[PDB]
Design a protein around this nucleic acid. Structure first.
Ligand SMILES: [Zn+2]
Ligand SMILES: [Zn+2]
Ligand SMILES: [Zn+2]
Length: 279
DNA sequence: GCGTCCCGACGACG
DNA sequence: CGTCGTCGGGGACGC
């Protein structure tokens, strides 16, 4: 069993997301529990929480099929203590918000040294940031997403994820989410079944599939090793459809939210359908 | 320096 | 009432 969806919109309320997900026949969906470009959001009201749950229950979307993503503003590895504290508070908020909504996963970006600390220093801060949050919450698993490696942003090498995990105490609540566009941009080839098997065997060796808690199926507008984060619709980009079919036929990707973040939402229904047809 | 990439609340419009 | 535009304000790309 595979859960295929997209990062649908939460405009007008979290329940709408589940509704939007159902409208395109998704068996999985991602969302923002609050605007990802602002520091503060009004606390969830029991009304919003209830409606969201009613919506999810109506369509049978279980916690294992939902992959909320945190704020863009958060840097769990910020070189400046004050800004790091702020990022930490926010991240804690996002995780507490997931607990209220009965969501067990939280997709977030690793962090950036902003040319002001070393890589180790930045990674250890991320580890610390996670321990701190898993310490102030329950039931929510921190899912680290690999990145394209733009600017001073870490997490483009599988080794960064493995190092961040080594520093986490409660390994039961830490995981990873692989974004095809990001891995490709980082330098992990996927343009053929052969490369996919190779790129994922590597992932298996340095991180291990027991930590995979989600996927981001994006094609790339950016190029191999460009370390540029620019997505594209499935098959219209530099990666191609082969990789996505390959993924759909590999059982190592079962029981997790496979989320589309392709550039044209209007064709998400077709993309979701095509992906399913690949199994 | 500015438009655009990795959006949801809400006020102004019509 | 539906829809659009602006604000918010981290880190970046590429011109
Ligand atoms: Zn992401
Ligand atoms: Zn992604
Ligand atoms: Zn991306």
């Amino acid at each position: 069993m595979k859960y295929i969806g997209a990062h649908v919109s939460a405009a007008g309320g979290l329940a709408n997301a589940a509704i939007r997900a159902a409208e395109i026949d998704a068996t999985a969906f991602a969302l923002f529990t609050k605007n990802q470009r602002q520091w503060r959001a009004a606390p969830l009201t029991t009304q919003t929480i209830d409606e969201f749950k009613a919506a999810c229950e109506k369509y049978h979307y279980t916690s294992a099929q939902i992959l909320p993503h945190d704020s863009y503003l958060i840097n769990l590895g910020h070189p400046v203590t004050e800004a790091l504290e702020k990022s930490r508070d926010a991240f804690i908020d996002e995780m507490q918000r997931c607990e209220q909504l009965g969501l067990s996963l939280l997709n977030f970006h690793p962090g950036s040294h902003l040319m002001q600390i070393s890589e180790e220093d930045c990674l250890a801060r991320i580890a610390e940031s996670i321990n701190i949050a898993l310490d102030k919450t329950q039931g929510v698993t921190a899912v680290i997403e690999n990145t394209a490696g733009q600017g001073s942003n870490l997490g483009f090498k599988f080794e960064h994820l493995a190092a961040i995990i080594d520093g986490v105490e409660d390994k039961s609540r830490v995981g990873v989410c692989i974004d095809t566009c990001h891995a490709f941009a980082a330098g992990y080839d996927l343009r053929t079944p052969a490369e996919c098997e190779k790129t994922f065997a590597d992932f298996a060796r340095t991180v291990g599939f027991k930590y995979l808690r989600g996927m981001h199926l994006n094609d790339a507008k950016s190029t191999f090793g460009s370390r540029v984060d620019r997505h594209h619709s499935l098959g219209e980009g530099n990666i191609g459809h082969d990789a996505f079919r390959w993924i759909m036929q590999d059982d190592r990707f079962d029981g997790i939210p496979l989320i589309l973040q392709t550039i044209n939402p209007d064709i998400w229904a077709e993309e979701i359908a095509w992906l399913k047809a690949q199994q």
